[PDB]
Amino acid sequence: NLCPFGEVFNATRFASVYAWNRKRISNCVADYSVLYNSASFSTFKCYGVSPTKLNDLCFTNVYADSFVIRGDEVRQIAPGQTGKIADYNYKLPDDFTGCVIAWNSNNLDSKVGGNYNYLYRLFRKSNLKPFERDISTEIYQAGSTPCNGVEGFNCYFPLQSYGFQPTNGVGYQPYRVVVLSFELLHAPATVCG
Amino acid sequence: QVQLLESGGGLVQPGGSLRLSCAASGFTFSSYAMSWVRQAPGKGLEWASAISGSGGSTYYADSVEGRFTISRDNSKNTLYLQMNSLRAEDTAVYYCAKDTGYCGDDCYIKLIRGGPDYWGQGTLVTVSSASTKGPSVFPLAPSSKSGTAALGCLVKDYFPEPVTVSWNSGALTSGVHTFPAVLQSSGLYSLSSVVTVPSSSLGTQTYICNVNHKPSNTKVDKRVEPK
Amino acid sequence: DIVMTQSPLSLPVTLGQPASISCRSSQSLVYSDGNTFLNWFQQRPGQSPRRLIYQVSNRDSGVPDRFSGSGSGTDFTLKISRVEAEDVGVYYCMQGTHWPRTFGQGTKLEIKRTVAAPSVFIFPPSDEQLKSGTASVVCLLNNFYPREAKVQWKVDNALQSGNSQESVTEQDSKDSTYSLSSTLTLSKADYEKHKVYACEVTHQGLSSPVTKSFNRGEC
Ligand SMILES: *[C@@H]1O[C@H](CO)[C@@H](O)[C@H](O)[C@H]1NC(C)=O
């Protein structure tokens, strides 16, 4: 039938960036006319594929990754980027083929007093490889003393909360991000425009 | 309206244990973080414990860590604080507080920051080595004097705090002064609750003081008549 | 842990004039998102604390416009435009940015008004208490200001000392006055061994000391 892009975009709740959700799109026709011709998107950037030509292509599978970050971190969802989100939360490959979509969600994901449901990984020993999902809550060892699972000096919880408030600046307001990855394998294609 | 009603306070010997309950209503209970705050007699506030909305994440102060365990039932809309191995310093009025922040299923305590939206009425727990004793209520009766006359009740020889005194089941509020309790040499508390009323009401209006001592589960109504 | 100091610990203020409370933090209260989580609480006697101001300058719902908050970083100030009678109580600043949530020592905001003389009443011990073996004589000082007042018990013109305890209510939110209760405790035999019991009250609002007395067994 029709690929369920509405389930991903118009979802009541989104996931934290460290626990980003992934939807597998296959065996359906994907009409992107609603997406790239919608004025409710702050960012719509495609890499290696033109958005207009998308309806004239066919791919083996499509992956729709969805999460929430702040506005200043939207640029980190791009190939070759660095930063806390790009290094420890969500990393795109250098040969990324697909589109990145992001829109402001201050009306949905923010409340007076702070929304603390959305988290991001702040500490990690090594950077994330592309499309890696790290939900570990092990205490980060910033020193030479083993932490043994108890917080303390040089032993910090890897996750932090955004604490979205509607009074925050646009750079600290919540943005919902959807990453469409079009994978190309030597297999029959099940997604077309 | 959001309401937080607290229960479980009373007297307990050192080393004992008791559980306090905070029944919350008027909001999505599972959506907000809940906390227990204590206040010693004549001391400032001191945060004691807190839970995330879902109940998976808990925080305890250093004074209470390991001793108390905090829990939550979202179905009952009730917050619980189990206090074990109690000591004299734990004697305080315990409040349950709802935070203004938005927490819950995928949130973590100790990662939040903000302030308490609403507070419960507060329940008192006393930790000491002494037996509960019900209060003695005596009438303070007005005399033939003067336009304004005064009457009241003497609540003497009770332990532990607190006692609540009302007049005419809450119908008399103006002019009522319930004095702070004083600790006698016997170790028992004694207070007086008085009211100033027009002299013309003596003879037409009957005055009854309602004294409630929860630690002894005693409730005494005493009518004060001019003798 | 972030320690916070309040200044002053006691803040006397007259009705209608502004009042100021200072709260200083040992550590900067600003956070990554440029948000400062400092709160101001008002606690009336026997009541739960209520938050007057959240995030330095934002007032909570139901808070009168007389209260205002200012400051940044480590130094903050709570301003009351014109202090009213209901403003009496203890005010706390709380740190919310970092766990553990810490509190200031708390400032006692007491108000000073026109001098009012106390209404003096005396209450003989009840017959029920006499049946219990003790006798408590109560002297009431109702609705006076200032708080400084002296109560003297006289039994057959003999001044008693050491067998009396006094307590003072908190400053009334309705009329900014105080009340005082003094209790003279005697045994049943000692009470029945004397006749005249008198309470003498000395106060600024009284031109002369006021004595209220009763005779045992007379009404
Ligand atoms: C999301 O918003 C509304 C749903 O009422 C609709 O107009 C829009 O097309 C939706 N977007 C989709 C289905 O991609």
Residue numbers in the entry:
A (entry chain A): 334 to 526
B (entry chain H): 1 to 52, 52A, 53 to 82, 82A, 82B, 82C, 83 to 100, 100A, ...
C (entry chain L): 1 to 27, 27A, 27B, 27C, 27D, 27E, 28 to 214
Quote the original article.
To shed light on the neutralizing potency, the crystal structure of COVA2‐15 Fab domain with wild‐type spike (Wuhan) RBD domain was determined at 3.4 Å. More specifically, C99‐C100c forms a disulphide bond at the tip of CDRH3 and interacts with N450 in the spike, whereas VH Y100d inserts into a hydrophobic pocket lined by Y352, L452, F490 and L492 in the RBD. Briefly, the RBD (residues 333–529) of the SARS‐CoV‐2 spike (S) protein (GenBank: QHD43416.1) was cloned into a customized pFastBac vector (Ekiert et al., 2011), and fused with an N‐terminal gp67 signal peptide and C‐terminal His6 tag (Yuan et al., 2020). The COVA2‐15/RBD complex was formed by mixing each of the protein components at an equimolar ratio and incubating overnight at 4 °C. The protein complex was adjusted to 15 mg/mL and screened for crystallization using the 384 conditions of the JCSG Core Suite (Qiagen) on our robotic CrystalMation system (Rigaku) at Scripps Research. Structures were solved by molecular replacement using PHASER (McCoy et al., 2007). Iterative model building and refinement were carried out in COOT (Emsley et al., 2010) and PHENIX (Adams et al., 2010), respectively.
SARS‐CoV‐2 spike‐specific neutralizing antibodies were isolated previously from convalescent COVID‐19 patients (Brouwer et al., 2020), identifying COVA2‐15 with very high neutralization potency. COVA2‐15 was one of the most potent neutralizing antibodies against the original Wuhan CoV‐2 variant (Brouwer et al., 2020). Many neutralizing antibodies have been identified, most of them targeting the receptor‐binding domain (RBD) of the SARS‐CoV‐2 S1 spike subunit (Brouwer et al., 2020; Chen et al., 2020; Ju et al., 2020) and at least a dozen anti‐SARS‐CoV‐2 mAbs entered clinical trials (Yu et al., 2023). COVA2‐15 interacts with the RBD domain through a long CDRH3 and makes additional contacts mainly via a long CDR L1 and minor contacts with L2.
